[PDB]
Amino acid sequence: XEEXX
Amino acid sequence: XXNXX
Amino acid sequence: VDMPRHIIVDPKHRYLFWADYGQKPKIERSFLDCTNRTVLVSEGIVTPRGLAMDHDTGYIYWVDDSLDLIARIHLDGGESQVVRYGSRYPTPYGITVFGESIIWVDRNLKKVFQASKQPGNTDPPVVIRDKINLLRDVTIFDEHAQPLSPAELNNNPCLQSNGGCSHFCFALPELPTPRCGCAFGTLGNDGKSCATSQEDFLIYSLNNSLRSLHFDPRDHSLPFQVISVAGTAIALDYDRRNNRIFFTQKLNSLRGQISYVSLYSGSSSPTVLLSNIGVTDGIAFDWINRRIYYSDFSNQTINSMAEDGSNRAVIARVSKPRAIVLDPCRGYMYWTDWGTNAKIERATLGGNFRVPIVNTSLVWPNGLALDLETDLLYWADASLQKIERSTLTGTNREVVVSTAFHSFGLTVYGQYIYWTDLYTRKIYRANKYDGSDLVAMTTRLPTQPSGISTVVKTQRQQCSNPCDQFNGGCSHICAPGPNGAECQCPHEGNW
Amino acid sequence: XXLXXX
Amino acid sequence: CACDPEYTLESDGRTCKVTGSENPLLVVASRDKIIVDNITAHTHNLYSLVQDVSFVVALDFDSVTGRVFWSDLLQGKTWSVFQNGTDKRVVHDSGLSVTEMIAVDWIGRNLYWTDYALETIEVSKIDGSHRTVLISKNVTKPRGLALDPRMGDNVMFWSDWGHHPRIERASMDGTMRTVIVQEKIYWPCGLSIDYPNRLIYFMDAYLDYIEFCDYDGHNRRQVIASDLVLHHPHALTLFEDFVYWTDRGTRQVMQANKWHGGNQSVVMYSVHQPLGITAIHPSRQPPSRNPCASASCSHLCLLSAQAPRHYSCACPSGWNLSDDSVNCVRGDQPFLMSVRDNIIFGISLDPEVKSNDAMVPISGIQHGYDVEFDDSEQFIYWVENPGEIHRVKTDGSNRTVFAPLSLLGSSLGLALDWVSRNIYYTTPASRSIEVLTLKGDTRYGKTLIANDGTPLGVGFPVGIAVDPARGKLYWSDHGTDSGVPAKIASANMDGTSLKILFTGNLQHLEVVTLDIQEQKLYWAVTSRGVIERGNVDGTERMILVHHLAHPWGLVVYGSFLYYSDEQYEVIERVDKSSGNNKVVLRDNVPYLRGLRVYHRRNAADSSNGCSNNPNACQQICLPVPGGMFSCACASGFKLSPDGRSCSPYNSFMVVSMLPAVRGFSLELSDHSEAMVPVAGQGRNVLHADVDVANGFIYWCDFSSSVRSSNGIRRIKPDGSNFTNVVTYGIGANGIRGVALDWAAGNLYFTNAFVYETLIEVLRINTTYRRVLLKVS
Amino acid sequence: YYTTPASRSIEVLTLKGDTRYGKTLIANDGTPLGVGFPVGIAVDPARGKLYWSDHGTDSGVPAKIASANMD
Ligand SMILES: *[C@@H]1O[C@H](CO)[C@@H](O[C@@H]2O[C@H](CO)[C@@H](O[C@@H]3O[C@H](CO[C@H]4O[C@H](CO)[C@@H](O)[C@H](O)[C@@H]4O)[C@@H](O)[C@H](O[C@H]4O[C@H](CO)[C@@H](O)[C@H](O)[C@@H]4O)[C@@H]3O)[C@H](O)[C@H]2NC(C)=O)[C@H](O)[C@H]1NC(C)=O
Ligand SMILES: *[C@@H]1O[C@H](CO)[C@@H](O[C@@H]2O[C@H](CO)[C@@H](O[C@@H]3O[C@H](CO[C@H]4O[C@H](CO)[C@@H](O)[C@H](O)[C@@H]4O)[C@@H](O)[C@H](O[C@H]4O[C@H](CO)[C@@H](O)[C@H](O)[C@@H]4O)[C@@H]3O)[C@H](O)[C@H]2NC(C)=O)[C@H](O)[C@H]1NC(C)=O
Ligand SMILES: *[C@@H]1O[C@H](CO)[C@@H](O[C@@H]2O[C@H](CO)[C@@H](O[C@@H]3O[C@H](CO)[C@@H](O)[C@H](O)[C@@H]3O)[C@H](O)[C@H]2NC(C)=O)[C@H](O)[C@H]1NC(C)=O
Ligand SMILES: *[C@@H]1O[C@H](CO)[C@@H](O[C@@H]2O[C@H](CO)[C@@H](O)[C@H](O)[C@H]2NC(C)=O)[C@H](O)[C@H]1NC(C)=O
Ligand SMILES: *[C@@H]1O[C@H](CO)[C@@H](O[C@@H]2O[C@H](CO)[C@@H](O)[C@H](O)[C@H]2NC(C)=O)[C@H](O)[C@H]1NC(C)=O
Ligand SMILES: *[C@@H]1O[C@H](CO)[C@@H](O[C@@H]2O[C@H](CO)[C@@H](O)[C@H](O)[C@H]2NC(C)=O)[C@H](O)[C@H]1NC(C)=O
Ligand SMILES: *[C@@H]1O[C@H](CO)[C@@H](O[C@@H]2O[C@H](CO)[C@@H](O)[C@H](O)[C@H]2NC(C)=O)[C@H](O)[C@H]1NC(C)=O
Ligand SMILES: *[C@@H]1O[C@H](CO)[C@@H](O[C@@H]2O[C@H](CO)[C@@H](O)[C@H](O)[C@H]2NC(C)=O)[C@H](O)[C@H]1NC(C)=O
Ligand SMILES: *[C@@H]1O[C@H](CO)[C@@H](O[C@@H]2O[C@H](CO)[C@@H](O)[C@H](O)[C@H]2NC(C)=O)[C@H](O)[C@H]1NC(C)=O
Ligand SMILES: *[C@@H]1O[C@H](CO)[C@@H](O)[C@H](O)[C@H]1NC(C)=O
Ligand SMILES: *[C@@H]1O[C@H](CO)[C@@H](O)[C@H](O)[C@H]1NC(C)=O
Ligand SMILES: *[C@@H]1O[C@H](CO)[C@@H](O)[C@H](O)[C@H]1NC(C)=O
Ligand SMILES: [Ca+2]
């Protein structure tokens, strides 16, 4: 539940 | 497929 | 071989032009009925996308994306004049002529151009609009481009009351009288009215309909206008004396039905004979004894009825019956079984002395046809994909068409055998002796052609019926036989 | 089937 | 009745059978498999000839070596193998593209084929040594092909399904070309020859028939016609009173009697469409004397129907047949290399020649934009999408991937420095201009110019032109938002002195090019549809051509300028001083791209520092104006104080992006990549940390969906010794932070579980791992 | 007034009454004076003037600030 491409 | 009208 | 793609019509000169961009590209000119085909351009043309006409000068303009060429030619023929060509005309796709200027669209450049129609002009074209995606065509909407006065149309017929023609009015280049065309049936002696063919033709069943087709492959006129019916029409046979077609119907999963429809000018709704009967896969009419024979598949019975309905009787029990054919003048009746063992069976028309005629190499013998003119039996097996012929004894078995596809209807008339194919959705024909002249009678139909019959205006074999005399001595039902009239009892109980 | 082999 | 020596009359007195033995085989091409059918007595035995096939199309065999030849459509190659399955080796490794059919000349030892995309008929030796285009004149869609090499006939047949379909006959050297069948065909598909009776069998897929006819086209008969058995026949071969054909519509191989078309039966069914078929037997290839056994022809020696010699000498693409008519010389004249999507062609500079056979075509390109060449060694260079540069010789040999260009994106432009042996290219993805060395056995590459914020950096470079003497790069540039303007720019070839030459109404700027002799730049602007000129001084500027649609490529050679318009689908020649004499070279050519002229330029006519002083620099040499040279080093290395040797980049900074990890120097004047970039598949970087003493860079990957893409990795700044550091026990959210203790050798990191978070330690080069804190 | 970059036109629509009436004012002819790719539009009801910003095209029409009467 965080930042990815 | 099947032999029907 | 030809593929006409873009077609234009000229009511003034009374000609029909079209472009062809397949193998052997060309521009063709023809009458309004497509009967005097001539080629205008056939050299230095590849992929003519579109063509247009200026009526006041009588030139045909066309565009070649494969040659980057815009050219024009007179109606009467001669030499092609190059209007515009070169690198700066990559893909002209559509053209039109208005007054002194031509207007065309270019697919690559996404522009609609306007330039002088006269060849050898060197003025750069003006752009009407730009950045239009996927341009295909351009046409002029003007009264000047579609003249209506008789003087401006060279006294064209069909301007008043359709020239008196019932269906179609085709003018001819220099004649003062129009050639009336017929959508269905044949043109009468009156020369402007249409009636039924009054000749021999095929009939076939299709979804919701009974449809008609001429024997001549080069005659495209319908012998009669399509008859519309409720439910799928599965099988049909023709009654000469009353000029009506007896045909069967399929409703729901199991609700079969039998009806008849008249081919006279009345053309009323089809009159029902039975309802609530099982699915019926074939039907035959006895012209001598005036009884109808039909097969019920869902109920494993072949049964007989009078032409009025009335008395009904079982003729045989059969594992999977399809087609039936009758030979009343010799008292014999044939039918096909595609059950656990597939076989063709023969009995008297009373249903007695049942014997199998051919009971080897058969899997789905759907179709059956008997030829009285040569005394041979024909059948079409859908699993083996073959049409075969034999003597009525089944001795001289021969293939007549190998790879027949998924045969269902079969009939024979003159020198040819006609069959319906459920796989390709076409009717084919072939020579009845050796299958040589094989052509497709129909294009790929929109749904499966379910059964086929002839319509014959001449009486068939007219042997004397022994059953009329005191009902042939029987108490209820009687049918002709090899020796004498054979009695049957109704199915309403035990007899 | 369309004639082109690709 | 009588028959040829290969046959014997039977007791019937009118039927002949083969001499005996050899058990004739029938070989069929299905997409994945070459099926062999061994015709043992009356039955059939099916098995695969070869294990490693992608899409087989054509088949033929050689009776003298016992080899089976095939074309693979997806690989773009011709192969052969022995009939027993051993010694698989390549015949043509490049330059085929939808090769339709093959025919082996067992007497002349030659190999003929038809090609659909090239629209040619080509011939080569049975080893594929020498290649030329035999017939291209009126050829549109050649498919079927057959030969009669027996002395006295020496004719070839082919079928064309173009706009005017026909079957043509010609001598096997392509001289006496004539049309034999043009009357009742729509889709001619597959040909075969009955050698004993001298009949040619052909088929049609639209009219659905099989017919045979004599060599002159007269006595034609129908074998199978008006028969629903034929759906879409493709290839045909006959043997002993039978025809075997492949039908693509019904996907099965059929047999029938070759005279009356009866006795029809299936030989085999196929899951895929069966395309080619051939019957392997000595009967299928009768022996004859070889007229060219004693010939002195260099290169190809082709059999011919000419009575005296029955042979003619021919020579590959790019050679002239000398006046001796036995020897051939190299055609050193220039030719225009027309880059297109999916193929690069070599066309003659003469507009009257429409052959496209100046070089062996380079098929199988993807997203083709630009090209370069090195006349020495005769190599052609183009870039491939995945970030590679490929090479091939003008004769189709030595096609290999030369070197990897960039790990950060795909390159667009190309330019070759032919005296220092360097290649300059643009990579608009990473927005840099870099160089790569052609000399030596080891590849070295340096980013020369990068996108800093200033007007002088590259914004989005499209084209490159190099001037070996006077040592300047020129490039065309679309600019960037809030930085670099759309411009024509120049630099020293070492990247030192950035300069803006022209800026103005350039919006859809295309490739730049240079006329070295006149020292003027040329470029095209799509937004205005013009081609412009300009001095390299940046002073004089003018419009040369008007009213273009979408110029893509342009090149200046001699007194003429050649440009290709992608929207007009044309290649045109104009004078380089003005438009004036417009001449069209090619038209109706789709997918046009950049252009280049292959011509003789030598290291003698122009020299610079890097040519005068080889071995001065240990890695890269870059010339600069005034005849001097600058040494340089590959990515990850810095030039030593000696100005000649290379050393690892001791001081730089690390920036981490989600796609990659990259290093930049502290001194802003150095645009080179100070570290070999960590990129490629499986990279999703959150943070990076460094280990200066031991020379390592630690980073943590992240992946929400795919596991094993989570963890900590290490790598040296030179790109060596990649190793996973932490892999086990990563939380649902990955390692969210990394910190290295350079004194104690401890590595701190954070695990991010869904409702928990750990701080952990790991001793480097050691399995000891501990949790320090757990928080919620 | 509104711009339709999909159709390369500047159009008008009527607010008064229960029946809507719409017209296209300027389209993309070959000339630079036409509409290339309209982004913004500002109208001056008095003095009867209409102003728009154009991205231009790969054609005669350049990137420009253009003006026209509201007819
Ligand atoms: C292999 O075979 C090919 C084809 O037969 C030969 O190629 C020809 O070679 C000759 C000799 O080099 C070329 O002739 C030269 O062409 C140059 C370019 O000319 C352009 O303009 C002319 C029209 O004026 C066109 O015909 C031509 O296609 C070009 O567009 C000229 O600049 C050269 O001129 C120089 O020499 C002449 C003659 O002495 C002088 O008068 C001039 O002042 C000048 O010094 C020259 O004419 C010819 O163009 C080539 N043809 C092709 C198709 O490219 C190969 O030479 C041959 N190779 C071998 C070794 O056998
Ligand atoms: C975990 O394990 C890894 C190996 O898997 C270790 O990695 C090695 O770390 C050592 C650290 O010393 C590295 O050794 C260093 O290499 C440098 C590069 O050498 C090149 O250049 C020198 C000239 O400067 C040449 O002599 C040499 O041939 C090479 O061309 C050297 O510059 C370093 O020199 C230092 O140590 C030497 C020896 O004591 C002294 O003489 C010098 O003055 C100087 O202090 C040094 O030799 C080694 O390269 C690493 N190998 C790998 C595979 O990367 C990690 O260190 C270890 N992890 C931890 C945290 O300990
Ligand atoms: C599969 O079939 C091929 C074709 O028959 C076999 O190739 C042949 O193999 C033999 C034995 O190795 C070769 O014999 C040698 O011939 C040379 C003369 O050319 C002679 O000097 C040697 O002493 C030897 O006799 C033969 O040349 C070769 N055929 C060809 C055309 O090259 C192959 O061996 C078979 N595969 C297997 C696994 O058996
Ligand atoms: C084929 O025949 C069936 C009925 O036998 C047609 O079915 C009707 O379709 C229309 C809509 O097109 C419905 O409103 C009717 O209620 C349907 N009738 C029944 C009995 O279901 C069908 O349209 C025909 N299709 C074609 C292509 O001929
Ligand atoms: C297929 O039909 C043939 C037709 O003759 C059947 O052969 C007859 O079989 C009966 C019963 O065995 C014999 O009494 C006849 O003498 C046979 N006729 C001849 C002339 O052979 C045959 O039995 C049928 N096959 C099947 C499986 O029913
Ligand atoms: C095709 O099959 C035949 C056999 O049906 C092969 O010929 C025989 O192969 C066996 C293999 O052990 C040998 O022992 C025999 O001596 C062969 N000859 C004969 C006459 O039986 C034949 O080799 C096969 N064809 C190919 C080339 O695969
Ligand atoms: C290629 O095709 C063209 C067009 O059919 C041929 O040109 C024709 O040649 C014949 C003589 O063979 C002349 O009668 C025609 O007038 C020519 N037509 C035109 C428009 O030029 C040409 O000969 C063929 N060339 C080759 C090499 O086959
Ligand atoms: C197919 O092959 C068979 C042999 O396997 C041929 O057999 C002959 O067929 C005719 C048909 O009228 C018979 O009269 C002959 O007696 C048969 N001869 C023999 C020796 O069996 C047959 O001719 C071939 N098919 C065609 C269409 O000709
Ligand atoms: C181009 O490829 C050929 C092979 O097709 C190379 O020639 C071989 O080079 C190796 C080098 O060790 C020799 O051992 C072989 O004897 C050569 N001949 C063959 C037929 O393999 C050639 O070196 C390549 N050229 C370049 C510049 O890469
Ligand atoms: C039309 O076709 C007929 C029949 O082929 C022909 O005789 C006639 O000359 C043609 N043209 C005219 C003027 O009817
Ligand atoms: C089959 O015959 C039965 C009587 O035996 C009859 O009730 C039924 O209608 C027929 N077929 C159907 C529709 O099941
Ligand atoms: C590191 O890289 C060198 C050179 O690639 C290699 O020889 C060596 O085995 C590697 N060592 C380790 C521990 O990865
Ligand atoms: Ca075109």
Ligand SMILES: [Ca+2]
């Ligand atoms: Ca077909």
Ligand code: NI
């Ligand atoms: Ni562009």
